[PDB]
Design an enzyme around this catalytic site. Structure first.
Site, short mmCIF file in Angstrom:
data_model
loop_
_atom_site.label_atom_id
_atom_site.label_comp_id
_atom_site.label_asym_id
_atom_site.label_seq_id
_atom_site.Cartn_x
_atom_site.Cartn_y
_atom_site.Cartn_z
N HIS A 12 0.88 -1.17 0.00
CA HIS A 12 0.00 0.00 0.00
C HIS A 12 0.92 1.22 0.00
O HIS A 12 1.27 1.76 1.05
CB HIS A 12 -0.99 0.01 1.18
CG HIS A 12 -2.03 1.09 1.09
ND1 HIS A 12 -3.37 0.82 1.22
CD2 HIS A 12 -1.92 2.43 0.89
CE1 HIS A 12 -4.05 1.95 1.10
NE2 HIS A 12 -3.20 2.94 0.91
N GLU A 200 -11.75 3.98 6.60
CA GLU A 200 -10.75 4.90 7.11
C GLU A 200 -11.48 6.10 7.68
O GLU A 200 -11.50 6.29 8.89
CB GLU A 200 -9.81 5.30 5.97
CG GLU A 200 -8.73 6.31 6.33
CD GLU A 200 -7.89 6.72 5.13
OE1 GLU A 200 -8.36 6.55 3.98
OE2 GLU A 200 -6.75 7.21 5.33
N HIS A 221 -6.59 0.16 4.74
CA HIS A 221 -6.90 0.64 6.08
C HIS A 221 -7.88 -0.29 6.80
O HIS A 221 -7.46 -1.10 7.64
CB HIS A 221 -7.40 2.09 6.08
CG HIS A 221 -6.46 3.03 5.40
ND1 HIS A 221 -5.19 3.27 5.86
CD2 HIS A 221 -6.60 3.76 4.26
CE1 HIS A 221 -4.59 4.13 5.05
NE2 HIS A 221 -5.42 4.42 4.07
N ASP A 278 1.92 3.86 2.79
CA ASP A 278 0.93 4.79 2.23
C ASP A 278 1.58 5.84 1.34
O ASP A 278 1.75 5.60 0.14
CB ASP A 278 -0.04 5.36 3.28
CG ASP A 278 -1.44 5.56 2.74
OD1 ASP A 278 -1.66 5.36 1.53
OD2 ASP A 278 -2.34 5.91 3.52
O1 LIG Z 1 -2.54 7.88 -5.46
C1 LIG Z 1 -3.08 9.20 -5.36
C2 LIG Z 1 -4.56 9.11 -5.02
O2 LIG Z 1 -4.75 8.33 -3.82
C3 LIG Z 1 -5.35 9.15 -2.81
N1 LIG Z 1 -4.65 8.81 -1.57
C4 LIG Z 1 -3.32 8.89 -1.35
N2 LIG Z 1 -3.03 8.46 -0.10
C5 LIG Z 1 -4.17 8.12 0.57
C6 LIG Z 1 -5.20 8.35 -0.45
N3 LIG Z 1 -6.56 8.14 -0.34
C7 LIG Z 1 -7.21 7.81 0.71
N4 LIG Z 1 -6.78 7.66 1.97
C8 LIG Z 1 -5.57 8.22 2.54
C9 LIG Z 1 -4.30 7.63 1.96
O3 LIG Z 1 -4.33 6.18 2.03
C10 LIG Z 1 -5.09 10.59 -3.24
C11 LIG Z 1 -5.17 10.47 -4.74
O4 LIG Z 1 -6.56 10.44 -5.10
ZN LIG Z 2 -3.58 4.92 0.49
#
Ligand SMILES: OC[C@H]1O[C@@H](n2cnc3c2N=CNC[C@H]3O)C[C@@H]1O
Ligand SMILES: [Zn+2]
Ligand SMILES: [Ca+2]
Ligand SMILES: [Ca+2]
Length: 331
Positions: A12, A200, A221, A278
């Site tokens: 992830h 989340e 998550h 992340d």
């Molecule tokens: O890869 C980029 C995309 O992913 C989203 N994104 C990036 N990190 C997270 C995202 N979305 C949801 N939860 C928080 C964290 O896990 C942002 C953009 O739309």
């Molecule tokens: Zn993410």
């Protein structure tokens, strides 16, 4: 500890949330794009969380400057390559890099399928150069609505043999997973694996929807799954992976402190929960920090940390042969 006799994975990990600050400066200069700061020291607070953000949507804005300098497909290839280099620098044997081609292409109106091709090219070059194994996960950025997400889906489908899975990410509360039923019907028909950011900012119902309607094999998550024991049981019995991102959850205010993070609870219930980063550049941490700082703070024992390390490969979107080869090498 990280066990050096077991493969180290991160499944992830957003490529487009991991654009190095120096690369933002470099590309801004190359393209004459005005930036909010001119040095690393002053750029950091604009591109990185310095303590915590008050909610998920506020955290998401921290990725904006990285993608605002992507003014050509070659710039996308560079950041994809640098992402494999970063993985190598963190001792990862295997990564799954997820990316939203529509989000990457947004600022400069790049061809969305061309962004997909550029990411594939940069990852291929990086894997050849550094020896990290990698697979690609395409993301639909729910934040921009169902029609924008269909454009991303079409772009990824034009490269479907190089894409291993589809994900849904972005503003969970504003754009529930139920809205993307058709997008995921098409993804499953294409033979892609499915993961979904769920549970989340929203509750266990979002996780159930991702599993039952979107066909999720893993959940990004899934923090709120602990609120429903039947859901916990279903995750464990059906071997639906949980992609835990400890520091991310602190920085989005999804959990107030790591002492109350559900990761330990997942592992005690037999759920295949894994440790992940992340958005490394945005968070200021990478996988080594998650193992040595975040996981002990979350109350995990040494054995539980090892189990999370094992689970990351077990839930990877890899064949049995590919998983065996990584285990045989590192043993
Ligand atoms: O890869 C980029 C995309 O992913 C989203 N994104 C990036 N990190 C997270 C995202 N979305 C949801 N939860 C928080 C964290 O896990 C942002 C953009 O739309
Ligand atoms: Zn993410
Ligand atoms: Ca290798
Ligand atoms: Ca053997």
């Amino acid at each position: 500890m990280i066990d050096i006799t077991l493969p180290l994975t991160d499944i992830h990990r957003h490529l487009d949330g991991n654009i190095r600050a120096q690369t933002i400066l470099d590309l801004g200069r190359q393209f004459n794009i005005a930036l909010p700061a001119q040095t690393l020291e002053t750029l950091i607070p604009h591109v990185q969380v310095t303590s915590t953000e008050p909610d998920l949507v506020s955290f998401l804005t921290k990725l904006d400057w990285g993608v605002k300098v992507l003014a050509s497909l070659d710039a996308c290839r560079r950041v994809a390559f640098e992402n494999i280099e970063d993985a190598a620098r963190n001792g990862l044997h295997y990564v799954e890099l997820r990316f939203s081609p529509g989000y990457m292409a947004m600022a400069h109106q790049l061809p969305i399928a061309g962004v997909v091709e550029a990411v594939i090219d940069g990852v291929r070059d990086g894997c050849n150069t550094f020896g990290v194994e990698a697979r690609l996960i395409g993301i639909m950025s729910r934040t921009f609505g169902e029609a924008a997400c269909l454009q991303e889906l079409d772009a990824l489908l034009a490269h479907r043999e190089n894409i291993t899975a589809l994900d849904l990410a972005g503003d969970e509360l504003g754009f529930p997973g139920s809205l993307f039923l058709s997008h995921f019907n098409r993804a499953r028909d294409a033979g892609w694996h499915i993961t979904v950011h769920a549970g989340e900012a929203a509750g266990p119902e979002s996780i159930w929807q991702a599993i039952r309607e979107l066909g999720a094999e893993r959940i990004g998550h899934g923090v709120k799954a602990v609120e429903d024991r039947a859901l916990m049981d279903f995750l464990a019995q059906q071997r639906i992976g949980i992609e835990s991102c400890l520091t991310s959850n602190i920085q989005t205010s999804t959990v107030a402190s790591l002492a109350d993070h559900p990761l330990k609870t997942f592992l005690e219930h037999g759920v295949l929960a894994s440790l992940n980063t992340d958005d490394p550049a945005v968070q200021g941490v990478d996988i080594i920090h998650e193992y040595h700082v975040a996981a002990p703070a979350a109350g995990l024992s040494r054995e539980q940390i090892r189990q999370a390390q094992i689970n990351g490969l077990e839930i990877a979107f890899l064949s049995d042969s590919e998983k065996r080869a990584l285990r045989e090498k590192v043993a």
